């Protein structure tokens, strides 16, 4: 069932977009290889999460 | 739907990706930033990402396309994705089932992330996150 991975990824990248608007979210703890997350880090993370959400959306629609 | 303060903020973010300063974002520069974050992107992943945003098809992202992406319905898509895991046709699945799908499939969220969505998404306070509550949280 091609839809299970696509659908999960859609949910997960959507929530990850949402969680990144909150600066205190535990979603910021997954960048284990950065010691001190600074302003320029967060801004590039915000952009990468948005792009990945748009990828996940196209792949979901491609699976249906 | 775009503040002028947002536009300059997005211009600054654009700069962090376009390090050569030629007004464009290539797959190499996206790869460079992601590896700088400790991520391990695949060259197809980088291609899917550029393709999703690159509206003119010249293989690269310049700032108007960046601006559009950051400014960009999603509701029904999220609803369809939730129904994929809807067994009994109820408006919900158990928190344990949700924790499984979120942690063991697709992106693989962390357990503290799933704790967070679970606490935040039970808007009505009855102990059960349903689909409609989840959607409203994101919208
Ligand atoms: Ca460039
Ligand atoms: Ca372009
Ligand atoms: Ca509830």
Curated annotation (Swiss-Prot), chain B:
Family listed: Belongs to the calmodulin family.
UniProt protein name: Calmodulin-1
Positions annotated to bind Ca(2+) 4: 122, 124, 126, 128, 133
PTM statement from Swiss-Prot or TrEMBL: Ubiquitination results in a strongly decreased activity.
Modified residues (N6,N6,N6-trimethyllysine): 108
Phosphoserine modifications at: 74, 94
Residue span of region Necessary and sufficient for interaction with PCP4: 73-139
Chain positions recorded as Ca(2+) 1 binding sites: 18, 20, 22, 24, 29
InterPro entries: CALM/Myosin/TropC-like (IPR050230), EF-hand-dom_pair (IPR011992), EF_Hand_1_Ca_BS (IPR018247), EF_hand_dom (IPR002048)
Domain of life, source organism: Eukaryota
Residue positions binding Ca(2+) 3: 86, 88, 90, 92, 97
Residue list for modification N6-methyllysine: 108
Glycyl lysine isopeptide (Lys-Gly) (interchain with G-Cter in ubiquitin) crosslink site(s): 19
Residues binding Ca(2+) 2: 54, 56, 58, 60, 65
Comment, domains: The N-terminal and C-terminal lobes of CALM bind to the C-terminus of KCNQ1 in a clamp-like conformation. Binding of CALM C-terminus to KCNQ1 is calcium-independent but is essential for assembly of the structure. Binding of CALM N-terminus to KCNQ1 is calcium-dependent and regulates electrophysiological activity of the channel. The C-lobe interacts with KCNN4 channels in a calcium-independent manner, whereas the N-lobe interacts with the S4-S5 linker of KCNN4 in a calcium-dependent manner playing a role as calcium sensor and gating the channel.
Cited Pfam families: EF-hand_7
KW Repeat (keyword) present: yes
Primary residence: cytoplasm
The EF-hand domain, residue ranges: 5-40, 41-72, 73-108, 109-139
Function: Calmodulin acts as part of a calcium signal transduction pathway by mediating the control of a large number of enzymes, ion channels, aquaporins and other proteins through calcium-binding. Calcium-binding is required for the activation of calmodulin. Among the enzymes to be stimulated by the calmodulin-calcium complex are a number of protein kinases, such as myosin light-chain kinases and calmodulin-dependent protein kinase type II (CaMK2), and phosphatases.
Molecular function terms, GO-annotated: adenylate cyclase activator activity; calcium channel inhibitor activity; calcium channel regulator activity; calcium ion binding; calcium-dependent protein binding; protein kinase binding; protein phosphatase activator activity; protein serine/threonine kinase activator activity
Record entry for activity regulation: (Microbial infection) Inactivated by S.flexneri OspC1 and OspC3 proteins, which specifically bind the apo-form of calmodulin, thereby preventing calcium-binding and activity.
N6-acetyllysine: residues bearing it: 19, 87
